[PDB]
Amino acid sequence: KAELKGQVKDIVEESGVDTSKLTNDQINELNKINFSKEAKSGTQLTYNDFKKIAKTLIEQDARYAIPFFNASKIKNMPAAKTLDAQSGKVEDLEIWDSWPVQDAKTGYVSNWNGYQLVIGMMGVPNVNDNHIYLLYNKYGDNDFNHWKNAGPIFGLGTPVIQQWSGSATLNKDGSIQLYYTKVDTSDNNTNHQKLASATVYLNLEKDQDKISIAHVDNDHIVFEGDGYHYQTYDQWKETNKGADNIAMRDAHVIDDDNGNRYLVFEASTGTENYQGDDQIYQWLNYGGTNKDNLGDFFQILSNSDIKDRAKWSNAAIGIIKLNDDVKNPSVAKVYSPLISAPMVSDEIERPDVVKLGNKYYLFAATRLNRGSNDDAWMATNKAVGDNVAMIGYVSDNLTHGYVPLNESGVVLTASVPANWRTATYSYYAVPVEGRDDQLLITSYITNRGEVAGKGMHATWAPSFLLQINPDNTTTVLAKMTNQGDWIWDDSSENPDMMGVLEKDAPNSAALPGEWGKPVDWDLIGGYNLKPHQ
Ligand SMILES: [Ca+2]
Ligand SMILES: [Cl-]
């Protein structure tokens, strides 16, 4: 004869559940719930927030849905026909996660001797070929065909040492301070990630409009996790049963007004709030009404895959302060995570902090299929054929105090199937000079590895404007650029890039053959898509 404890008895009664209808098993589970109110790891993406983000995606609301793109206008990047870091030979690469060289305080795209500079991950489709390359164009030149490739930052290499995403800013002497993810795969092919930095010096040949990589100096590891705030590789190795994610990547540089420099990055929580079975019993993780939470608790416990995922989910967006050695930084201070998703997701990527007015806006990309709630993310695939989102938060202070935008944190939601030419990912907001209430959203378009078809390569998306409202909401605007436009300037707007949800329109969001084509095995691609209203 098991008896409910005091606090949980109140919850059960408030929820309209008849206490005498509970089994001993259910009672014993309920008595394990921890009703602590103290947040251990920053602002959380809760189980309820995740459900709300999925529901908002399914609704395909004009406020949040990624705009439709004119599929017929999308081209592979001409500058991606280039020497491949892993072969030394010219091949047709694809390009995905990319970032501009930008001012550390304002985020504005830097003007380097009349050029704009972008660093991006590129490689041959369906090869494990993860390295970073420098791309350049005249500053304010919106023509996608004009970008040129200066080649791989670190020259030729192999899959043993990889470079994944980060950020970059100029030094006073005109070198680039690059923050990137160094990945070592020598230990049973694990992706052992570390935050690294290097100083990159460029040579300009003016009469050829040609930029080359001249010197790479000070290449070293900045941060690998501390174990308390952020999970280390050794901790991950010790707990893994084969289904735990590892993250220490995507460092985004930002300076405060006093010129202290920080990196904001993707990681997992350490022993401050570690993953595990115990997370299922932390009421704070649920984030709905007491009644909603009670229902969620039983959903998790009764479904083995959701329960498994819940035990391993502990994504975090972290922040560290660097010391003042700009070209050769070390860590000065490690903070608690800004955002975390214990019990909820094991992957939140590409964090991006932008200062607008006197507030800090933090955005991140995520694939909802990395979340614990299989029913929620499976519903997004059924509605749209994809499960990607951008989430966002706002704070008065850089290092703490973030509040979710649009209530749940939702900012952008997938609008087309993952295997269409116009699918996007890796959203990255860039500020716009002279428009302090808007951001330009850049992304890559077409998923990697020929999922949209042979010859359909990941490439730079048309960019679009996002309106930021002072009441902690956002709205997608009907303003769109050429592919690969990182700078919103007087000639950026190109309405021809806009797509429509119509099978045979010349500006259809679908290429011929895509409307109705299977996705996720037998789902009809596009079947449940609706005009954005
Ligand atoms: Ca985990
Ligand atoms: Cl490297």
Curated annotation (Swiss-Prot):
It is found in: Secreted, Cell wall. The chain holds residues 176 to 708 of 797 of the full protein. The gene is inuJ. Optimum pH is 7. More than 85% of the activity is retained in the pH range 4.5-6.0. Activity decreases sharply at pH 7.5. This is Inulosucrase. Optimum temperature is 55 degrees Celsius. Activity drastically decreases at 60 degrees Celsius. It comes from Lactobacillus johnsonii (strain CNCM I-12250 / La1 / NCC 533). One of its GO terms (cellular component) is extracellular region. Its cofactor is Ca(2+). Ca(2+) 1 binds at N142, D485, I487, S492. The keyword NADP does not apply. Changing N130A: 29% of wild-type activity. The active site is at D97, E349. Belongs to the glycosyl hydrolase 68 family. Its EC number is 2.4.1.9. One of its GO terms (molecular function) is inulosucrase activity.
